Every structure is written in structure tokens, then in C-alpha cells.
Assembly symmetry: D2
Homo-oligomer: 334 residues x 4
């Protein structure tokens, strides 16, 4: 079927002066955290997945107030995930199936994704996403300040190539059973130049030559056991130094670190807060699964509630952000 190329969506929704400026600078600001030049804490926070742009915009307006408030301690960027990797099968996100009913209206979904990202950046909220597909990025990577490569794809050569050509910093998650070396290796690969086949903005396949991405880091997201504590952070930091790549890392409070219990994301954040207080020198960022309303639901019946992984609600979100900001204020004072 008949896919509109990126240029069609770029013509309807060109990046504005403000969005372009916000993306450019947030990427720069994140590079400084990745390389230990600034000691603010990157916070990637928001829904497991976007299934309703309206709830997403409401969420973003609340989050914007806290982004501003804590701007000296925390660098807040919203989770805006449009592509979801499933264990076997299931809804792959808003792009793949925006009407949430098996109609796979991908043109509508890409348009909605771009429109949401443009609106977010226009309001002052930078955005992040996981890059899962090789073709979808040309539709909206210009509006992304930070990207993730998921646990299920960190070891994949086509995803490392993708990352090597992205203009934003990229986090690589450790593997689903806890393997960190694949992520360390991914930084090596993505940091170098690659030649590979991709698709242009006009929608045609082409040979691209990337320059490499100097702003990649790892993300600790648990395995058979959680890997967020000081002992794990120290082990990982030594392995990063050994490989000659940045030893500054991100810690995901959710997924296999909370072991799929949204109420434990706060516990993880408190452990991180104590590391920042005691030392915490290898930590540059945290990831949190958060929505307007806590929990999850199989069907999109309740507004502002996840249909994928369970999230903390808005009030726990305010608490969690206050805790990290206070803890990092103390770290930054040393």
C-alpha cells in the first residue's frame, strides 16, 4: 500500500524556528551530560507508550512547569514513544496502528506522531523516543532531542548503524537478561562511520554514509536481577572505561529494574538519590515510566492511563522529581 514519503509530512508540518532551536540546544546540553561536562541529571520521563495525543499534551503542560522549576538540577525531557517492541506479538504503537483497532493506518499515524512532536517542541518540552524501525525516523527525527535503542535491538547491527547517523544523543539499553557488553559494544559501533542502505526523505532507497555519533551512552534497565545499585554502577563504569568509552550512564527506574511493579520505580529513584548524595559521579541520567493516572489497562477506556506497561501517576511523579532534584543539588555543590 501507498506510503506518503517524509517530505509530504515535512511540507504540512515544517519544523518552526522555536522547535528547531530547542532541539538543537537540548541535544547540545545532553552531549555535555554524556561527557561529564555538566552535572545536571537528564530525566527521560513520561508514558510507556503514546496512544492518545490529547492526554499527551495535557501531561506535557504539567511536566513543563517542573522542567522549568528544576532546570538548574535536572534536564527534563518527555518520553514520547511511538514504537513498541513486543515479546511476541501485540500493538506496536501509535504509528503502526493509530486507531487502536487493527487497521494499520500508518500514514495517519506518522502524521499524528509528527504533529504531536511539533506541538510539544513548540510549547517548550523536548521529546525522546525509541527508534525501532529503520524507515520511520526520517519522518520525525528532526524533532527528537534524545533517542533510545531498546534492549531487544542494542545487539543489532542495523540499529547501531541507525544510531551512527542520528543527530541526537542515543542511549543503548543493556540486554533483556542483563548483558551490558552489548551496549558498550554498541557505543563503539555507533561512534564510527558506516555505509549502509536507507531510505531518503523522498521515499527512495539509497546508500548513506554516516559520520558516527559521539554522544552514545548505556542505560541500565535490569536483567534476571535489577542493576541500578552502586555496586552495579561501579562495575559498569569500570567496563566502560576498559572499552575506552564514556563511563557516564543512565538508570531506568522501570522495566526489569522495578520488575514490572510501577510502585517500585520510587524505590529505585530513592536508591539513585542516595548514590547522588554519597558520590554518584558516573550517573548522568534516569528514565521513568509516568502518566497522568497510575496503573495500566488492556483497553483505552480510562483517559491518561497506559495500555502498555504500568506507570506511576502524576502525584507520585511530582514526588519523584522533587527527590531527584534535591539529591542532585547536593551532588552539584561538590
Amino acid at each position: 500500500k501507498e506510503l506518503l514519503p517524509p517530505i509530504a509530512h515535512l511540507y504540512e508540518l515544517p519544523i518552526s524556528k522555536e522547535a528547531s532551536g530547542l532541539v538543537h540546544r537540548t541535544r547540545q546540553e545532553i552531549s555535555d551530560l554524556v561527557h561529564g561536562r555538566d552535572k545536571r541529571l537528564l530525566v527521560i520521563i513520561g508514558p510507556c507508550s503514546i496512544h492518545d495525543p490529547k492526554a499527551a499534551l495535557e501531561y506535557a503542560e504539567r511536566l513543563l512547569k517542573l522542567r522549568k522549576q528544576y532546570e538548574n538540577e535536572l534536564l527534563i525531557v518527555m518520553r514520547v514513544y511511538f514504537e513498541k517492541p513486543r515479546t511476541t506479538v501485540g500493538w506496536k504503537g501509535l504509528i503502526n496502528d493509530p486507531h487502536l483497532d487493527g487497521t494499520f493506518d500508518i500514514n495517519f499515524g506518522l502524521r499524528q506522531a509528527r504533529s504531536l512532536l511539533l506541538s510539544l517542541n513548540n510549547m517548550g518540552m523536548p521529546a525522546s523516543t525509541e527508534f525501532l524501525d529503520m524507515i520511520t525516523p526520517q519522518y520525525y527525527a528532526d524533532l527528537i532531542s534524545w533517542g533510545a535503542i531498546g534492549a531487544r535491538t542494542t545487539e543489532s547491527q542495523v540499529h547501531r548503524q541507525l544510531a551512527s547517523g542520528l543527530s541526537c544523543p542515543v542511549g543503548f539499553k543493556n540486554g533483556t537478561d542483563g548483558n551490558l557488553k552489548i551496549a558498550i559494544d554498541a557505543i563503539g559501533a555507533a561512534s564510527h562511520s558506516h555505509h549502509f542502505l536507507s531510505v531518503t526523505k523522498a521515499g527512495h532507497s539509497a546508500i548513506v554514509h554516516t559520520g558516527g555519533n559521539p554522544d552514545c551512552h548505556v542505560i541500565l534497565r535490569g536483567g534476571k536481577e535489577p542493576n541500578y545499585d552502586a555496586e552495579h554502577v561501579s562495575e559498569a563504569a569500570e567496563q566502560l572505561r576498559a572499552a575506552g568509552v564514556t563511563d557516564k550512564l543512565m538508570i531506568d527506574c522501570s522495566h526489569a529494574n522495578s520488575r514490572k511493579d510501577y510502585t517500585r520505580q520510587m524505590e529505585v529513584a530513592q536508591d539513585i538519590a542516595a548514590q547522588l548524595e554519597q558520590d554518584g559521579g558516573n550517573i548522568m541520567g534516569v528514565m521513568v515510566e509516568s502518566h497522568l493516572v497510575e496503573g495500566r489497562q488492556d483497553k483505552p477506556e480510562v483517559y491518561g492511563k497506559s495500555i502498555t506497561d504500568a506507570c506511576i501517576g502524576w502525584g507520585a511523579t511530582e514526588e519523584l522529581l522533587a527527590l531527584l532534584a534535591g539529591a542532585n543539588k547536593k551532588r552539584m555543590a561538590r
Copy 2:
């Protein structure tokens, strides 16, 4: 950003012949038979870790073809013709990506040579197998491939499971690099279903594709932190496959983590499989073997017929290993 010819340009210059088309169609059907337990021959995916020299490849194929015919009642021999290689971090990604082996990345030439070699192989009677790594290169030559692999590093990847769901050949999913078998079992489940995703057409344009699912996927045991080739591991995998409601017939890789990356250990693994086939071995439908004209590996392509990637057994050792497997499977089939 450089000037890629679309699949239709290569297809025009190198159209599939009646003979190649018959060989592919038959070989896929025969392999399907093995996957679903209808025939008890052993699929043998055998040849170089990587193809870097089409002359040496054609010579290899010539020698192998005699053995394919000789052992045809006990073994279904298909050549490894791997054109895309995953690197640990960085390095030469294969003949397609850089066919002149010097960082000129002449991909139009690479794709052309890959198709030419596959067409020449099928025309001489040797079916071909490859690892599908890239999302766009398959359209250039998948019509000439009888069996496909998704590698250990990409079995968990949703975009690779999608690709597999639209392939017309049977597909083997390798267990993960540390030993995880569940990802490959999950992959069979995923690739067996219909998917909708973005891909590139034969004309070189991006499009929405809707696949029908691939009913002929299976797992490949290739070792992890510890090897997983033995009877206990096979029995344990078979139980997991049945619990997930997918085929309990599997393939065993003698190389990579099952040989502890020591090419001289491939024969020990094959000897263990032979022993399983003689005793029972009902869940084994195939084996994988990294093999070339000359054993070992080299950083540079100085020696003819010697791998520049993973180390391989040599030709003599290939005769030994194939004879061992054909003997042992003859007995399995007899009962």
C-alpha cells in the same frame, strides 16, 4: 548519500532461470518437510563463515555438489553463502557492503556480484542459504535463497521477525549470544503471524507491506556461555518448543559458541550429534558447519580459500564430517 540501483535493475540483467527456480522451489519444500517432521533426512547448512571471493566460492560449491549427490538419501546439503556479517563493534560487514575489501563500499557492485554468484550456484545444482541481516538487501536476491537464517544478534529484534514473516523460504532463528533459547521460540511465534510494516519495493521505493506469516520457522542451537548441542539440551529445548506450540524439530550449529570459537572442535560436536542420531535423535532436523577449502582464518585475504572472518575447518575435514553424519543418519532413517 549515493546512487543505489533498485532491485529491478539487477533482476533485469540476471533473471532467475527455469532451472534455478525449480531448484529453489523444491529445496524450500524439502526443507519444510524436515521442519514439520515429514522426512528424516538431515538438513546440512555448510560452507564458509563469509563469502569474500566468488572464485573460491564456486570451487567450494563444485566439490560440495558431489557430496550433496552422494549423500542425498541421508542428508540435504545446502551451501552457506553468507554476504552480510555482524561485527562485535566494527569491521568488514561483507561482500555486499564492501566487495573490493578496501573501504570503497561499492554496494551496487556487491549486490550485482552476490546475485550473479547465487544464480551461478543454483544453475550448477547447489542450493544456497544466507543470513538476512539488512532490511533492504533481501529484495535483490531472496528469490535465489532456499533457506534463511536470522542471527543470534537479531533473533530478538521485531524488525527481523517482521522480515522473516514475509520471506518465502524456511527460516532458522538462532538462540541468543549468551544462550537464551526463549527469544528464538518467541521469534517463531512472531514470524508465523501476519504483520504490517514499512519496507522497500523492487522498484526502490518505500511502501507499506502486509505479510502472511512464515509457517516454516525453527530454532538453531549455537551455544551461549556454555555449549548447548548435547542430548540433554536438545531434550530440554524440545520440551520448551512443544510447550509454546511450535515445531519441536531443531538445528544444531557445530561452530560459534558450540565449538567455543575453536574450529577444530566442530568435529567433536558433529560426533556428539552422530551419537544422538544412532541412539534416538528424533528432534534433530539439521546441522550447521563452518567450512572452506583451507582451515583457520586470516586478517587479510592473502591465502586462497581461507576465511577472513570466523575460522573454518578445511576441505579434508569436511569430507570426514559429512561422512560421519551421513552414516549415523542412515541408521536413524532405517528404524
Copy 3:
């Protein structure tokens, strides 16, 4: 530079159910006139060129009332021509929508499709001249009648194009009056052709067309005017000799009025007289009309042409009443 393909525009501006029905119906009604099943007179009327969407909609709202009023005698369809072909030298609303040498073709094609959809949606069907081989895919779905101009009637590329169009097509005689080239064009366009074209996705392809059975000639003058009974009778003779339809359209403007735009009325009266006497070979007329009569080099006066001079609204009422009255009498025989 970076051309959006037709599918980008078709996505933002899908044809409505109402527009689709109007185009479908009007094409058929026109075909009925081309082949003598109905004796209403097609009238292709409106500006020489469209340079202002706002004025074009205002003109359409006025024309719509007369379209309905005269519907038993006349089939009124608006002229929505975006440009000229030049002898040489403003390059039309598509090729240059900002009227300033910036050639913003993406914007121009978008604006063209937008206007055509709005026109169809209000009940006014639209006609245009197809000048190039690529632009038609962006809006031919909104066109009820197409023209091939005098300067391109003889061209094999344009005959091919016409053979694949889903609307009826009029071929103008040559710039110096040559009628044979238009007669030959109908014959060429009625057949199947294989040739290279561009798809709605923006890619070159081989297309195989089925032929267009609803083509006709248009008399637009030359070395001398060719609107009178004598010239109409000779054309009809030549048409029947070539085995194609002997129903034709008369352009009141261009080389039939020459240097006086007000002569369109005289041509129209001569046509009225033919209709009253007999006039059996006339299926249509073309008229260059706008809100305000005349022309201007620069777009200062609202609703006045910036290409060829046009009769104004009051004279348009006059000319349509005249034609409707005359054709009423022809249909009553």
C-alpha cells in the same frame, strides 16, 4: 528542487463524495453532447487565466445561478485555466503562484487542487487546458472537460495524454487555422497508446491507455475567423470524412475575436443565428469572461484579467441569455 508527488496533495485534499458525483455526471452529460444524444449547448466560460482564488470563487457563485437557470438549454462549466502557453514569456498560478518569478510549484499545485475542490463542492464543475505531461495527475480527478491548445494539438505527446484522460477533450485547431491537425488528433487520442508517464507516487512508468472516445474539435480562428456557418459546414464535412464525430465547439475568443474582446458578443450572435436556423453540428462554445471586463498588466483591480481581455459580468449575462434563448429553439425542433 523537491517536488511533492500527487499523493501528498491527494492526501491533504481528497475528492469529496459530492465533487466525485459532479465530475462523474458532468463528464457523461458532455459525452452525450459530443455524440448527439442531447442537444444542450456546452458552454466553457470563465477567465482567460486564474490568478486569484478569491475572485474565482466569487465568479463561480454568480455563474452557478445561471448554470441552474439555464440548465435545460445550456450545460455551463467554468474555465479554470491556471496559465498561458506563450508565443514566448507571468507563468500561471501553478508555475508561479506568488506572481513574482519565484516559481513555487509545490504551493501552486496545492492552491490549484484546493480551488478545484472548492468549485466542485459548491456545485460548479471545472475545465482546464492540459499543457504538460506531469501536472495533470495532481488534479485531473476534479476536471469535467479538458482542452488541448492550438500549439499542442499536433503533438504526439499531447495526443497520448488525451488518450488516457477520463474526461472529454477538445482539440483546438492550429494557430494559423489548420483544422486537419485537430481531426487527426481525435483519431489518435481515440486509440490505445503505450508510453512513458509519471505515477501518482511520483515515479516514471510505462502506461497503457484505453483510448478516449469523447474527443472533439474546437474552432478558434486562424488566418481568418472560422466561427460562421460556412466554416462549420466545411469542418463537419471533413469530420465525417475522417469517421469521427461531426459535433464541434466554437471559441468566441482568441483568433475568432482577434483584437476586440467585445467581439465575443458578435460571434455569439452569429452562433445564435446558426442555432435558430439549424446549427446541427454545434455542441458547444467557449467564452472568456470575468467579473470585470477588460484586462490589466498588474493585479490591481479585483476580478479583472491579467492575461487576455475578458467580457465583464453584465455582458456575460447578456451572452448567456442570448445563447439559452437560441438553443431553446433548436432543441424544440
Copy 4:
């Protein structure tokens, strides 16, 4: 149906150093003629249409010997016409239907046309053709030293735009009834820059901005009456100067100047030969319909015989060229 783009053909049949040099040199030589820097006579000579590459190459090998023999007096370039305009319907040429059987194998036809042109340039014979289609030129214009726009398309805006973007000199024929102003007007238009839609080497439609073609001229090819004589040449020269364009022009010995009778081309050439002897300062070239065997045939039964317009045969061709060379040697001595 499934059209290979130009790049597919360019990859299989890249232009050689030799062909590239011959085309560059020949284009420059022809420009010098159009602008009166040189008084050699351009001679565009060969079949009405190509229906058989084998005969065309045999024809070229004979013509090369004369090309070389007359090089100080004549600039001989072969007619290699692959696209034919029909009065109503009929075979449109080798590209459109190479197997001459209603199969329209256009991929094969383009491949065969490019192959022939490359072979011709490689043997030392430059080539000319009529550019009828908007899309086919990308496949082989790099191998063409001179182009024609036909009588039936000279008045066409799209053909004038096409001409404005070509790298070769272009001749515009007067209209089919004898109108010369359309060709004079065409030179005007094709000398300007244009913006229009075209198709790329990769097979995608795009906006192209051409720089104008400063090497255009008119071709006198007859109308109701012929227009080859001194008086018509003299009339056309005055109008060229009046429009401010080159008053050097080309005369077609065939088509409407021969009343469609192949035995009259020699009479036209003889008239031209007298003008060249008397004065003939405004003539820069001639066009002649020539083949191995004279006349025409309905089916491709006889080898080297036209299936379109009737042509003079090889013997008459030698006579005609000797005549023009002898006459122009004298013009050039003054």
C-alpha cells in the same frame, strides 16, 4: 508497467572517454557553425528511422569514410532517429516497440538505443536524434551531438523547455504548413532559463531549473510549398536578425522540401550547392534522408531499407556529399 530508470542503463553502458570526447568536440564544432565562427557545413544524414542496429552500424562504417574525407568542408553527423511522430497512428520507433510487433518492450528498446549510440560514438561517428518524448532523453542525451525538435512540436512549450535544458545544439523545424515564426519564437524561448517538471536519472519527477540553450537554430523543411531556395533563405535570415537570434540556418532536403519524394532530395541539394557557390552565407547545414538501400517498405523484409519515409540509397548519398563538399570548399575559400 515496470520501467528501469536511466541509472540502470548508465550503469550497464557508461559513456567511454572516447565517446565523451567526441560528443564534447562535436557539440563545440556545431556551436561554432551556428554562430558563424566556422563555414564548414553541418550535414545531418542517415535513415528516416532506425529499425535495425545491425544495418545502422554498417551504414555508419561507410559514412565514417566520407566523414573523414570531407572533414575540412563538411561536418558529417549520422541521423539516429529512435522516436517518430505519426500523422495519426503508427509505429513510433525502436524505443517504443523494438520488436516491431506491437509488444511495446520499452526497456529493451531504450537499452538497444543506448547501446547503438555508444557503439556509434566509439567508432568515431557522432549521432543526432529528434527528442520527441519528455522522459526518454535522460536515457541517452549524453551520447547525442545535435538534436531536432520536429515540425509538429516546435510550437510546444514543453519541447521548448526541454530544448533549454539540453547540452547539445538544437534545431527547430518550421511548422508543417510552412510557418517559420514558431521556430524563430522557439529559439527565443529555448535560449532562456526555465522552471518546469521533469524526471531524474533515478526515475523520480522533480523541479528542474534550466540555464537556456544558446546554440539553437532553425531548420527549413518546407510547408504547403518548399522553402529551400535563396529567396526563402533570404526572407528567413532577415526575420532571424529582426528577432535578435542567429541568422545561420539549416535546410532539410527531404520531407516537405522534397514533396515527400526521395528522388527530389538531390535537386534540393543541387540548389543548395548553387547558393553556396554564389554566396549562401546564411546556410550552416543540411539534412538528408539516406540509407543503404533506396526507397521504403511496409514490413522489415529487406535489409537496410526504410520502413518509414523513403530514403536515397548509398550510391546517391556519395554523389550528394561530393557535390556539397565541392561547392562549400569554394564558399570557404572566400
